[PDB]
Amino acid sequence: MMTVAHMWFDNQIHEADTTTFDKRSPTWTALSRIAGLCNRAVFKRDTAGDASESALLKCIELSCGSVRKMRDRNPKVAEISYQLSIHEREDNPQSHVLVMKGAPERILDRCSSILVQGKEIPLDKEMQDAFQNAYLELGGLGERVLGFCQLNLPSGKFPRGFKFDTDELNFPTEKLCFVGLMSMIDHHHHHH
Ligand code: NI
Ligand code: NI
Ligand code: NI
Numbered sequence: 382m383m384t385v386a387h388m389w390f391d392n393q394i395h396e397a398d399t400t401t402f403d404k405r406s407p408t409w410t411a412l413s414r415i416a417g418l419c420n421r422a423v424f425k426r427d428t429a430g431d432a433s434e435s436a437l438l439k440c441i442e443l444s445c446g447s448v449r450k451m452r453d454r455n456p457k458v459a460e461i462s463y464q465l466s467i468h469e470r471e472d473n474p475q476s477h478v479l480v481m482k483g484a485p486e487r488i489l490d491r492c493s494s495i496l497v498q499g500k501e502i503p504l505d506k507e508m509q510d511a512f513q514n515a516y517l518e519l520g521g522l523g524e525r526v527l528g529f530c531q532l533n534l535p536s537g538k539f540p541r542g543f544k545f546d547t548d549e550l551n552f553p554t555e556k557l558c559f560v561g562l563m564s565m566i567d568h569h570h571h572h573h
Contacts, residue, residue: 383436383565384425386524388412389515390561391498392508400573401444407499412561415529417441417448418455419466419480433525436565459545463487465554467534467545476536477543479552481529485516485562488528492559501558515562524564530557 385397395402401409416437422430425439441448455468463483470478495504519526545551
């Protein structure tokens with residue numbers, strides 16, 4: 382049974398509440414959403430979906446509340462299974478946000494920018510290294526590591542009700558904004 386153990390964002394490793402750290406950061410707001418929306422899985426309880434998304438669903442459910450309700454005000458418009466999905470932003474219904482997850486390194490390659498304390502900054506060398514190092518620690522704990530990114534689709538070219546072509550990409554899947562990593566562990570010993 383999977384459970385999110387750690388995560389990397391705002392350039393810092395975080396412990397997942399086994400009972401994230403500071404939720405204040407808007408970066409955590411986005412990661413949380415990417416982990417809840419780019420996720421097919423419903424009901425640490427009885428799952429229905431693959432292991433990883435099961436854990437994510439549990440993590441976000443406990444850390445942020447009803448993901449059921451999160452998925453409700455962020456209508457799925459398109460989807461693929463990396464894994465991605467586009468939604469009508471709760472923020473402003475008129476625009477869309479592309480949420481994607483998958484292999485850390487492959488994910489990283491599709492990102493030009495990255496969020497640090499809510500601020501989007503180019504994903505230069507320094508940051509790529511911060512990522513490699515993080516990716517090394519978490520993977521080194523024998524945990525399954527996932528990468529999370531998103532992209533606020535321009536409302537001009539992708540207005541509300543734009544027919545996204547899931548097969549033949551009718552949109553961009555490159556130059557996304559890296560948000561964070563989330564590592565999960567395959568077992569437990571006791572509960573607190
Ligand atoms: Ni730890
Ligand atoms: Ni153990
Ligand atoms: Ni203990």
